[PDB]
Amino acid sequence: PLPWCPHLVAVCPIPAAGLDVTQPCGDCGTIQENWVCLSCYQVYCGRYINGHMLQHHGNSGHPLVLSYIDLSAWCYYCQAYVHHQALLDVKNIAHQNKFG
């Protein structure tokens, strides 16, 4: 992945509620291929289901999203995966919820 991108500044503090990697899409309710937005922590489905996270990027401009399938982080502006120290806390909290 890229070691940095100019949109990491838009990653917001993790809710005290934590993350639920089984949360469904906020628009269509699917349990498949969901992502969480790292700006406002809403959950929406991926490009191969109904494309609601791409729609959320378009209507909010929020840049960076985390996959509940593989814990990768994608930037919609850079069109690339990113890994950085600024993403470790959210990835680690998601890993703990997913795997125990």
Ligand X SMILES: Cc1n[nH]c(=O)nc1Nc1ccc(C(C)C)cc1
Which residues of this protein are in contact with Zn ion, per CB under 5 A? Answer: 5, 7, 25, 27-28, 37, 39-40, 45, 50, 52, 60, 62, 75, 77-78
Determine if 55 is a binding residue for ligand X (CB under 6 A).
no
Size of the site for ligand X (CB under 6 A): 2
Q: Which does 52 bind (CB under 5 to 8 A by kind): ligand X, Zn ion, none?
A: Zn ion
DSSP assignment string, 18-68: ---TTPPPTTT---SSEEEETTT--EEE-TTTT-HHHHHHHHH---EEEET
Residues that bind ligand X (CB under 6 A): 47, 74
